[PDB]
Symmetry: C3
Subunit: 225 residues, 3 copies
Amino acid sequence: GPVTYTHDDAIGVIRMDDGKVNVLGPTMQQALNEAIDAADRDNVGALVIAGNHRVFSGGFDLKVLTAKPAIDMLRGGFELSYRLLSYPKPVVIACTGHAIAMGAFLLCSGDHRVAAHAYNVQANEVAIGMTIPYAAMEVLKLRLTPSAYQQAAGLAKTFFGETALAAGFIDEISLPEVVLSRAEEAAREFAGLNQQAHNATKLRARAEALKAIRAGIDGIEAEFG
Amino acid sequence: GPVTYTHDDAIGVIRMDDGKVNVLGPTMQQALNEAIDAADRDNVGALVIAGNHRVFSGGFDLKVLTAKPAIDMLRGGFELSYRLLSYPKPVVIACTGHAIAMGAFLLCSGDHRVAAHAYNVQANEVAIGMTIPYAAMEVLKLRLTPSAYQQAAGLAKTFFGETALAAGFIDEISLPEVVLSRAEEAAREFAGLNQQAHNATKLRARAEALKAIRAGIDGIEAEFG
Amino acid sequence: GPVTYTHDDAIGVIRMDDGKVNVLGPTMQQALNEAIDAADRDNVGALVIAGNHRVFSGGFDLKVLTAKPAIDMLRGGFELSYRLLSYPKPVVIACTGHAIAMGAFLLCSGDHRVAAHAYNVQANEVAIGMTIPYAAMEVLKLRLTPSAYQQAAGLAKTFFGETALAAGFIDEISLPEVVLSRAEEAAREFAGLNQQAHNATKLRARAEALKAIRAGIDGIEAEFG
Ligand SMILES: [Cl-]
Ligand SMILES: [Cl-]
Ligand SMILES: [Cl-]
Ligand SMILES: [K+]
Ligand SMILES: [K+]
Ligand SMILES: [K+]
């Protein structure tokens, strides 16, 4: 399958690799959800989500998006963001290559985000004639600076490295060969925080956003129906 | 008149030059509105707003501000911000010199803002004994970082170059001799985005702010009446 | 006592030094409140709050926090933040060493915040098993970038120098030997702003946050009761 789950002492590691660009279609979404179910079963201290050697994720499966299967894929994508944003343990994203559209929203759904200098991060929807869904806007608004939010969304601006960090698309820049190892190291460090206080505090930090993402998930049919 | 409009293939270019500091009094406001009407008529792909060689704009005509003519000038200034923030095409600001008070709010009313390193950007109201209007606060809050918003507003802090960029007062720094040419280049690039998706997305990115600016415009009489 | 107040022409200067780490227990809180009362009596043009040579403040007195005395200390700490955030004159923080937990929230309660490169600023609550109070979250949210807010709160991230400045924990970096002198200089400069416009504008910039801090103060018993 397109997802590999490993349980490594204090952490769970989930690696996406569909042999292509890790599109978040129904197959990948199911595989991710099952992997997180496995982490839940193991009661991991922290969880790493990684891409493959060429990308984090290129986004949704656009063949599907281009009514019901498209709606289900959209809902499932944003439900995954919600699941990771409300995860009771720290979540670290190993952004192992570019993160585009739903890949960028997924990247913005973890607590700590590690990327290499060259990796592009872009909500390219407007450049290809798609309006950004309300749930995705809320995910962006939660992390981007006010001015980077405007440009990322309305102008499909591409960020990388220092601009991605300043914008709020990522939290740490690492050399490409250590993005995954550094994400795993960070996750081990974060598993040392008090879990109860971490979860209580992250939810306070995200209360309005999580409500609005839920509303955005509920309203998908009223946009792509 | 103080405004020149030119239609250049995919873009409209509006250049302010009253031979002084481009104060946004009733004459300039009418001239700007008529120029945007002309862009609307031409159905331009993107719109550039530029200052003159010495300033973007020094702000309102303070002789007028220092009840009804002052109220009308205030309302018209913030209505222009609203018009540009809700413009259905990309708007690029060529910040060709300093942008002070209403000039800064106008600067913050476009999608992409280009300035040179040396150009000061400042809401100087508090330094000269004026409370910042509610509509202007909303314009600032939409673009500035949380901490830069506090300082810009409450302390009349002056920004330029790297500090203006980090703060969220501008989006791009160019050499002074290419601010206008770079703004026009960017506008041509943005005219290539899908217009419908751009507009739908920018409005989602600005929904609350636009409502609050409207409320701030409506409440002007209750402050300067 | 642990607080020294001096009145120096246009400014008041309040210096914390309990001979240790300036914990914000009931004794320090009372001493701070009495010092601000003295500044109010003098109608100072601006107010400086400083730590000692080793710290700004290490936070609350954790012996007390580890029900009623803990509730009173919590309420009083956040009431001090509210008092400084709504102060009608400019408030400058001389962050003379590290600022941890309530020390960081106090640091975030002034208009202009000066620190040296090496000084750590951290809400360490989650690292030591404490959930961050709602009033403290609102203080952080008012100043930190969206992404720095998430990390500061949920991951107990430590900031200093350029990262503290970019994050929105401080506004100015000075050499350690001039943090206090620079804070006093800045306060003199800010006393030159129009007081009435400063206060009217800062309150507009803080309206929602101040309401939410008040709600957070009121709800303390429902969390530590
Ligand atoms: Cl939607
Ligand atoms: Cl007003
Ligand atoms: Cl609380
Ligand atoms: K999308
Ligand atoms: K004004
Ligand atoms: K606390």
